[PDB]
Design an enzyme around this catalytic site. Structure first.
Site: not given
Length: 211
Positions: A18, A24, A155, A175
């Site tokens: 990102q 995110c 997150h 992630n």
């Protein structure tokens, strides 16, 4: 099933990055939908984070957002491909291009319900939030994470499976910090942990798209 890993099931795309943009929530939402399409249609199609970042109106662009509302957007408006609408690492003009995928809706997993969380992960990829603002979390490299988390859930990430090493249960977490973080972009977070809400709060606000 004692172990689940959708990365080995041909329905999960490579780790993405990102950058600095707080997008995110768009990556988390895209990752969950891409896998759902792979499972449901045996078709791998890369979807556009950028459309959500630019067009989803409840979120704050590069200052955060809501993957649940992103799911609602795709159910109402459809979503175009990553190839048609690539990520440019900042929010821009909202473009409505030819859409390639829809979903019918989404569901919310009750707060702190790691048992129900596991039941859903055995069928598809789930969007979750974690407490990422800590030196331990940012500098994670390998193993089942056992460092300190941030103070608040901040997150958006994904759970793409679960397993066990040395009798320690874990979640497999995708992630959007690129492949130089964690285990080729992934983290193994303790599963059934002694942190209520899950380790780093992973079970606090879990949600998944419905085909």
């Amino acid at each position: 099933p004692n172990s689940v890993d959708w990365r080995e099931k041909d329905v999960v795309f490579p780790i993405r990055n990102q950058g600095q943009c707080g997008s995110c929530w768009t990556f988390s939402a895209v990752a969950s939908i891409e896998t759902l399409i792979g499972i449901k249609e045996d078709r791998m199609i890369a979807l556009s984070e950028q459309e959500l970042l630019d067009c989803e109106r409840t979120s704050y662009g590069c200052k955060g957002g809501y993957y649940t509302d992103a799911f609602a957007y795709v159910a109402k408006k459809g979503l175009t491909s990553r190839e048609k609408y690539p990520y440019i690492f900042q929010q821009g003009q909202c473009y409505q291009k030819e859409k390639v995928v829809k979903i019918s809706g989404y569901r919310r997993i009750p707060k702190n319900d790691e048992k129900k969380l596991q039941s859903v992960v055995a069928q598809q990829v789930v969007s979750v939030g974690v407490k990422s603002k800590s030196r331990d979390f940012q500098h994670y490299r390998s193993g089942v994470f056992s460092g300190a988390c941030g103070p608040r859930v901040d997150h958006a990430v994904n759970i793409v499976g679960y397993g066990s090493e040395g009798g320690v249960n874990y979640w497999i977490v995708r992630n959007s910090w690129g492949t130089n973080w964690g285990e080729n972009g992934y983290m193994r977070i303790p599963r059934n942990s002694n942190q209520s809400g899950g380790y780093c709060g992973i079970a606090v606000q879990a949600a998944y798209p419905v085909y």
